[PDB]
Amino acid sequence: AKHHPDLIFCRKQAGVAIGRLCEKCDGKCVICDSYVRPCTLVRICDECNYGSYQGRCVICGGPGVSDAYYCKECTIQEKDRDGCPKIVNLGSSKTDLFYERKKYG
Amino acid sequence: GGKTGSGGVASSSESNRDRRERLRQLALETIDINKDPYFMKNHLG
Amino acid sequence: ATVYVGGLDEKVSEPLLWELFLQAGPVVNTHMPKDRVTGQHQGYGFVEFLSEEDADYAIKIMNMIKLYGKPIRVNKADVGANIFIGNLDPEIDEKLLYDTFSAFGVILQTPKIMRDPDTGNSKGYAFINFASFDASDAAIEAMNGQYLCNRPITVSYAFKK
Amino acid sequence: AHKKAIRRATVNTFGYIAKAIGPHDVLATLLNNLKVQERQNRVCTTVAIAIVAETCSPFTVLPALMNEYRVPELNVQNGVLKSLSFLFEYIGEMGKDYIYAVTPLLEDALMDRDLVHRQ
Amino acid sequence: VWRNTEDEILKAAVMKYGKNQWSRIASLLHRKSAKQCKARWYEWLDPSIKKTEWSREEEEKLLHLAKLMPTQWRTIAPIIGRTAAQCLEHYEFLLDKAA
Amino acid sequence: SKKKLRRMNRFTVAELKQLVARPDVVEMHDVTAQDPKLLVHLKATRNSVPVPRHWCFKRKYLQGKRGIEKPPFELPDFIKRTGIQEMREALQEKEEQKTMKSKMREKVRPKMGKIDIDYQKLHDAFFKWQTKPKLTIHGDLYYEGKEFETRLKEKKPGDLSDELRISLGMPVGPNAHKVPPPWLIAMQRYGPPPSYPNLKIPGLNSPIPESCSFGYHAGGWGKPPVDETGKPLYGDVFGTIDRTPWGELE
Ligand SMILES: [Mg+2]
Ligand SMILES: [Zn+2]
Ligand SMILES: [Zn+2]
Ligand SMILES: [Zn+2]
């Protein structure tokens, strides 16, 4: 996601396991963060696909429901060729909002 | 008491846009009232 | 290499000035150092064109150059100081006449041939204001009675209207 | 709304009702929104103009965008720029007809009016 | 609090509208009420209020009064010509410089 | 200091300007580069593009563009033809006359189809009346103030203009060639200016431009310069393959 500079990709070698999206995350690209003309499917690292990690949102991490794609722009600049694009770190914002809430109510 | 045929009351966005316009006409007024040579409005408002 | 743009037309910009200097020669600088308040050109301007003979033929060509209609003077950088002239040639031109008589003084009037409106040929008469009355003395003394273009000249200080 | 599902759906239905009616009236009420001040609504109207233009062909809505870029506010000039960003990404390969209409606007914006103009 | 920018917009509003229409003046500002606009004008912004230093006549007054009518600053104040907050801070000031 | 040993390595600017094949290219600080011979060789390669002017400037870039006032964007001609401009002006003035009451009232009872514009004119404007603007060739970077340069290197007298001829008292338009500027009279009198041996005068050193007339009344081209034998003074004042494109649409 081109929006939050604080996060990081697995970046390790590809596989054959298609990638899946949570319902919040459904429909967007995984790097370009677009909403349009999706072209190719996502393939994820075996490690980042092993065990509990099967069938989750690459981005969200929740329960995967749909297959992730790459926009035509990522496909043309070949940014789909870098191996597992799973964000392997939670970020500041998740725990931040969580704590603001758990204080609020 | 009210009157019929009216529209509603403006939402925050329209009220704030009208506030900004009013604040602009105010300042053009007082800038004239002080005959200020030195002020200009550029093309970004 | 330096040229004085006098009579520099009130609105004739450095664009027109240097575009005329470039159309004649290697225009390396034109400048109207002007009235530091009104911004309009100073009625006096300094233009450097690198070549001396360029500046020379430029001054030769830019006499009576009509910037904003008014003749703009390019040269080296009204008490009645005029000479009237009789026995003039109808084959004469005013630019050529300024080139001829101007060595005794610059052209503070362009040499007007007193010619009728009916046909358009000269009547043998003309008038032009020089720079000085001493200039009128020199010009009319070195041009008095001598052989002009076609009719031997006859020139004296101006009779006024 | 604070929820992104609602705003996405809202923009889509601006597209649909532009398909039912013509584009002009919905597009006029959408340039007016670029006169607001909170950014989330203006970014969502910027995506809605892109959608209207892509459903009903871009040649209908371009002259009105390019003209709206002449009104003296920061937020509406960035509104029409961001709207073109979205529009060109949506229409994709058919950009090749409007690229020449657009470029004189972009060079004009890339000679600054603001940091955000150039961005 | 109040910022130079609000203050100058207030001054201009008041100078156009007058000192009894606080509700439209309060409509001109964001995050400000008519109660607060009025309080600010009559506490600090009014050009009748003087922000100088105390003539020692003014300070002998302040001391004499603040002893004769103790704790009554809105009553003391007009008898000497500055607002109650100024009188009060400057009075504590003399008290501690004297202590 | 080993820093000062690297400084002992630092050629003088004339050292550099000497060794390298093109010295013009060498600027001041070029000496301070950890590879000055490379740097200058790369500055002398064809078709490359020099760094932007403002890397040293202490003010930032168009933050300096700041001061003056600017006219609004100017629409292309092929978009003016369709008249969208005056349309949207009319609505802007109407809505500025509107007050909050009437604004909400039309939010609740719209005036549908108040005004319109036709298609097929938008369609002709984009698919049949479009034109290529003037583009910039490779390497013309922009900098603050590029657009307030009139032009330069225009050494040719034949290039006339409209404001020029107007405030000359000469006509612009199709009769520009038949319109003689104030310079041609003294051109025929004492040659072209002596930096321009190689300028040819319309009507004085070259033939009459088509449908212009040699003559000495108002609007003519004089008595053409020639010698006492009959040979013109400059040029000729009286006017003594298969370039088809190869694969092109019918
Ligand atoms: Mg009633
Ligand atoms: Zn998700
Ligand atoms: Zn993408
Ligand atoms: Zn992985």
Swiss-Prot record, chain A:
Site location (Interaction with SF3B3): 16
Location(s), subcellular: Nucleus; Nucleus speckle
Binding site residues for Zn(2+) 2: 22, 25, 57, 60
Residues recorded with modification N6-acetyllysine: 2
The keyword RNA-binding belongs to this UniProt entry's keyword annotation: yes
Gene Ontology MF annotations: DNA binding; RNA binding; zinc ion binding
Positions marked as site (Interaction with RNA): 99
Protein name as catalogued: PHD finger-like domain-containing protein 5A
Taxonomic lineage of the native organism: Eukaryota, Metazoa, Chordata, Craniata, Vertebrata
Gene name linked to the record: PHF5A
Curated annotation (Swiss-Prot), chain D:
Transmembrane segments: none
Site positions for Interaction with RNA: 74
Compartment list: Nucleus; Nucleus speckle
HEAT repeats: 55-93, 96-119
Region spans: Interaction with PHF5A: 89-90
Family per similarity comment: Belongs to the SF3B1 family.
Task performed by this protein: Component of the 17S U2 SnRNP complex of the spliceosome, a large ribonucleoprotein complex that removes introns from transcribed pre-mRNAs. The 17S U2 SnRNP complex (1) directly participates in early spliceosome assembly and (2) mediates recognition of the intron branch site during pre-mRNA splicing by promoting the selection of the pre-mRNA branch-site adenosine, the nucleophile for the first step of splicing.
Subunit-level organization: Component of the 17S U2 SnRNP complex, a ribonucleoprotein complex that contains small nuclear RNA (snRNA) U2 and a number of specific proteins. Part of the SF3B subcomplex of the 17S U2 SnRNP complex. SF3B associates with the splicing subcomplex SF3A and a 12S RNA unit to form the U2 small nuclear ribonucleoproteins complex (U2 snRNP). Within the SF3B complex, interacts directly (via HEAT domain) with SF3B3, SF3B5, SF3B6 and (via HEAT domain) with PHF5A. The SF3B subcomplex interacts with U2AF2. Identified in the spliceosome C complex.
Protein name: Splicing factor 3B subunit 1
Upper classification of the organism: Eukaryota, Metazoa, Chordata, Craniata, Vertebrata
UniProtKB/Swiss-Prot annotation, chain E:
Signal peptide: none
Membership in a protein family: Belongs to the CEF1 family.
Tissue expression from the record: Ubiquitously expressed in both fetal and adult tissues.
Modification after translation, per record: Phosphorylated on serine and threonine residues. Has no effect on subcellular location nor on homodimerization. Phosphorylated in vitro by CDK2. Phosphorylation enhances interaction with PPP1R8.
Protein known as: Cell division cycle 5-like protein
Superkingdom of origin: Eukaryota
DNA-binding region: 22-45, 73-95
Compartments in which it is found: Nucleus; Nucleus speckle; Cytoplasm
Job description of the protein: DNA-binding protein involved in cell cycle control. May act as a transcription activator. Plays a role in pre-mRNA splicing as core component of precatalytic, catalytic and postcatalytic spliceosomal complexes. Component of the PRP19-CDC5L complex that forms an integral part of the spliceosome and is required for activating pre-mRNA splicing. The PRP19-CDC5L complex may also play a role in the response to DNA damage (DDR). As a component of the minor spliceosome, involved in the splicing of U12-type introns in pre-mRNAs.
UniProt disease annotation: A chromosomal aberration involving CDC5L is found in multicystic renal dysplasia. Translocation t(6;19)(p21;q13.1) with USF2.
Gene name tied to this protein: CDC5L
HTH myb-type domain mapped to chain residues: 1-47, 48-99
Residues of the full protein shown: 10 to 108 of 802
From Swiss-Prot, chain F:
Region: Required for interaction with PRMT9, residue numbers: 1-101
Protein name: Splicing factor 3B subunit 2
Domain of life per record: Eukaryota
Recorded disease: Craniofacial microsomia 1: A form of craniofacial microsomia, a disorder characterized by a spectrum of craniofacial malformations ranging from isolated microtia with or without aural atresia to underdevelopment of the mandible, maxilla, orbit, facial soft tissue, and/or facial nerve. CFM1 is an autosomal dominant form characterized by mandibular hypoplasia, microtia, facial and preauricular skin tags, epibulbar dermoids, and lateral oral clefts. Affected individuals also present skeletal and cardiac abnormalities.
Modification type Omega-N-methylarginine: residues: 59, 66
Effect of residue 46 to K: Does not affect methylation by PRMT9
Effect of residue 81 to K: Does not affect methylation by PRMT9
Residues of the full protein shown: 450 to 712 of 895
Phylogenetic placement of the source organism: Eukaryota, Metazoa, Chordata, Craniata, Vertebrata
Parts of the chain that traverse the membrane: none
Result, substituting residue 61 to A: Does not affect methylation by PRMT9
Effect upon mutating residue 66 to K: Does not affect methylation by PRMT9
Organism per entry: Homo sapiens
Record PTM text: Methylation at Arg-59 by PRMT9 is required for the interaction with SMN1.
Residues found modified as Symmetric dimethylarginine: 59
Compartments, record wording: Nucleus; Nucleus speckle
Linked residues for Glycyl lysine isopeptide (Lys-Gly) (interchain with G-Cter in SUMO2): 43, 94
Disulfide bridge positions per record: none
